[PDB]
Amino acid sequence: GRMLGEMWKAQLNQLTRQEFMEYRRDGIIEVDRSAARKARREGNVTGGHPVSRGTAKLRWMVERGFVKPHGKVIDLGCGRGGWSYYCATLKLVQEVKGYTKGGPGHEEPVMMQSYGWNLVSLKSGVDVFYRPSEQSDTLLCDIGEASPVPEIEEARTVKVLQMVEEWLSRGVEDFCVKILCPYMPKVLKELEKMQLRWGGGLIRVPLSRNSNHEMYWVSGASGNITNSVNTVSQMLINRMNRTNRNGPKYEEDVHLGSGTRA
Numbered sequence: 001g002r003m004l005g006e007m008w009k010a011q012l013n014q015l016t017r018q019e020f021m022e023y024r025r026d027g028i029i030e031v032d033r034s035a036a037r038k039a040r041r042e043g044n045v046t047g048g049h050p051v052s053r054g055t056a057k058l059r060w061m062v063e064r065g066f067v068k069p070h071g072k073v074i075d076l077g078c079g080r081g082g083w084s085y086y087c088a089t090l091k092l093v094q095e096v097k098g099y100t101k102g103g104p105g106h107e108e109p110v111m112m113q114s115y116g117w118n119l120v121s122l123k124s125g126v127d128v129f130y131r132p133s134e135q136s137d138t139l140l141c142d143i144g145e146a147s148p149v150p151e152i153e154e155a156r157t158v159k160v161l162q163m164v165e166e167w168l169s170r171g172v173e174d175f176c177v178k179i180l181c182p183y184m185p186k187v188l189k190e191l192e193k194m195q196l197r198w199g200g201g202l203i204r205v206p207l208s209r210n211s212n213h214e215m216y217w218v219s220g221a222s223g224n225i226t227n228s229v230n231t232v233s234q235m236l237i238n239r240m241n242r243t244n245r246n247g248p249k250y251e252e253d254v255h256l257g258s259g260t261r262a
């Protein structure tokens with residue numbers, strides 16, 4: 001038998017494009033980024049606007065205690081830097097190192113002056129899958145590229161977990177790791193072993209789009225992995241089958257201020 005999430009992916013792939021676009025943001029929470037997009041086009045780096053939607057997703061988890069960034073934070077796949085700049089605003093964070101691939105088709109780090117920007121060092125041109133691990137107090141990873149083929153998303157997710165395993169073995173106190181495809185067998189098998197060793201649990205951020213099944217493995221959660229994943233699959237399938245669509249529920253984006261930290 002298959003996990004319900006496999007069903008969801010098959011049904012997702014059968015939507016027309018118009019159906020898909022009507023579904024992907026139906027009933028999710030979305031922060032309004034109109035001012036942020038104007039800020040990046042105007043080079044406004046002091047207005048507190050996050051560089052991406054990712055900031056609001058990590059804020060959601062941090063304010064619920066699912067991860068408590070502190071000390072030295074390493075941000076794997078930092079992209080423009082939304083997670084890294086957010087952590088540098090936090091009282092217990094002392095240093096943020098972000099690594100991302102960059103180059104054609106990939107986001108380059110953006111230089112911002114949000115609060116605590118001077119604690120952030122972002123490095124492009126870095127393939128984290130071949131980078132030696134380093135010590136960290138907080139380990140973040142937001143990597144996982146979508147595909148219509150669930151076996152490709154499965155393999156991509158397993159590769160992330162095998163990399164994270166090396167970084168966690170350095171001794172990490174807090175973590176938050178994107179699980180792109182949590183319902184496929186090879187991901188479940190690996191995650192269950194890694195939960196046994198390192199703890200944590202899977203959570204679904206309601207800012208995630210209905211067009212993906214992404215969940216985050218976070219140190220400040222617990223709970224059965226199979227049940228957590230199934231709960232998300234049923235929600236996403238329920239939303240796909242309720243065809244009176246409303247678009248997202250809008251909320252306010254994070255304000256990251258400006259200024260250096262001592």
Ligand SMILES: C[C@@]1(F)[C@H](O)[C@@H](COP(=O)(O)OP(=O)(O)OP(=O)(O)O)O[C@H]1n1cnc2c(=O)[nH]c(N)nc21
Pocket residue numbers: 012013014015016017020146147148149208209210211212
């Ligand atoms: C093919 C996919 F399965 C993608 O593998 C997944 C994520 O496609 P996506 O790039 O939007 O990812 P998403 O936006 O959710 O994630 P974030 O940006 O928040 O990180 O949706 C499906 N998909 C994309 N386009 C279409 C489409 O035209 N028609 C249909 N039927 N399915 C589509």
Ligand SMILES: Nc1ncnc2c1ncn2[C@@H]1O[C@H](CSCC[C@H](N)C(=O)O)[C@@H](O)[C@H]1O
Pocket residue numbers: 051052053054055076077078079080081082083084099100101102106107126127128129142143144
């Ligand atoms: N092998 C790899 N090594 C390093 N970065 C990678 C990678 N594969 C993908 N990435 C990067 O992972 C990034 C995920 S971006 C995630 C959003 C980010 N947390 C924010 O808040 O802005 C992408 O920019 C992508 O280019």
